[PDB]
Chains A and B, each alone.
Chain A
């Protein structure tokens, strides 16, 4: 249930191919406050679609 010969560092790297994270690239700037909030996510202060939504 174990290895037979150790895998090469080359074969090690190929297994790490599909491990890079994906960047966001969807930072919608708010209409009024202009924060860098994600789409369909409220801002850091609680603004969404140009509205004090959180009341906080």
Chain B
């Protein structure tokens, strides 16, 4: 009855649920903005935010930890070098959620998740 319960299943078993966020987070970091379904977007907010908070500091331990999850040398180098200093001042809240339209083919409510900055 999920009283005071967190998380979302997203109609998947745990392992697949976890592994797709490992992929979705790195997909975000490399592109800084992605289009996805709204409930998936809200659950992504509890994943990338820890990483940007992990990149607000810097060490060898954090470099291994942010490599422990997310399993990518490219992303971890994209992290800890640009995204960290770019978000050095913000106290949390590094993502924006913009609700786009409706995915015609499953009628899913899609949305845009991007970084706050995205300065070009």
A and B touch in the complex (CB under 8 A): yes
Give the B-binding residues of A (Cβ under 8 A): 40-42, 48, 53-55
The interface residues of chain B lying within 8 Å CB-to-CB of A48 are: 98
Q: Number of contacting residues on B, CB 8 A?
A: 8
* Complex CA distance for A41 and B112, rounded to whole angstroms: 10
Which secondary structure characterizes the binding site on chain A?
loop
Which secondary structure characterizes the binding site on chain B?
strand
Task: Out of B99, B100, B101, B120, name the residue touching A55 (CB < 8 Å).
Answer: B120
The interface residues of chain A lying within 8 Å CB-to-CB of B98 are: 42, 48, 53-54
With A40-B99, A42-B112, A54-B33 given, can you name 13 additional A-B contacts, CB distance below 8 Å? A41-B99, A41-B100, A41-B101, A42-B98, A42-B99, A42-B100, A48-B98, A53-B98, A54-B98, A54-B112, A55-B33, A55-B118, A55-B120
